[PDB]
Design a binder for this molecule. Structure first.
Ligand SMILES: Cn1nccc1C(=O)NCc1cccs1
Ligand SMILES: [Cl-]
Ligand SMILES: [Cl-]
Ligand SMILES: [Cl-]
Length: 163
């Protein structure tokens, strides 16, 4: 575990993370995809060998010894708000199980279902709160990666509020 488990947020490409493993915002088919997924495909393409997994699940594949946790959030274009909310919560719970299983002291994690799977809605708070619900019982340092300057501020505020 980390000596004093923390949450942090950085506004930069998660392919440049300084953590012991990464969470991919994957598609269910293990395709290269777009946004975070495409960045992860560029950096760790070996990790997409048999990475396909259903919605609401996480599947870890090594790139060398570097774990890539493929976490499949729901596409809110296809799910009802209710069912999507349940699958988004479930994907983060599976991430917390994988992070624990791997024994890492740190993890880089994007906000699932906030990009092209958001169904055109701002889901920062929904996705971040499900992240916290899952990760709070883990002792890994969690570093959340985002690209939007306003999101960085809001994620940072949400973290510092609970400290
Ligand atoms: C941190 N990062 N590295 C590369 C691209 C991004 C990013 O956060 N993009 C927006 C998305 C959030 C979830 C799916 S796409
Ligand atoms: Cl960058
Ligand atoms: Cl997304
Ligand atoms: Cl963002």
């Amino acid at each position: 575990g980390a000596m004093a488990p923390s949450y942090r947020v950085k506004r930069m490409d998660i392919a440049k993370n300084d953590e012991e493993c990464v969470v991919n915002a994957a598609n269910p088919r293990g395709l290269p995809g777009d946004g975070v997924c495409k960045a992860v495909y560029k950096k760790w393409p070996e990790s997409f060998k048999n990475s396909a997994t259903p919605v609401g699940t996480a599947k870890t594949v090594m790139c060398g010894t570097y774990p890539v946790i493929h976490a499949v959030g729901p596409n809110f274009s296809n799910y009802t708000e209710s069912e999507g909310d349940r699958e988004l919560a479930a994907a983060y719970r599976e991430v917390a199980k994988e992070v624990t299983r791997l024994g890492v002291n740190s993890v880089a994690i994007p906000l699932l279902s906030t990009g092209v799977y958001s169904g055109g809605k701002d889901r920062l708070t929904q996705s971040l709160n499900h992240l916290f619900t899952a990760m709070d019982s883990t002792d890994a340092d969690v570093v959340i990666y985002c690209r939007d300057k306003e999101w960085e501020k809001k994620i940072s505020e949400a973290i510092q509020m609970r400290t």
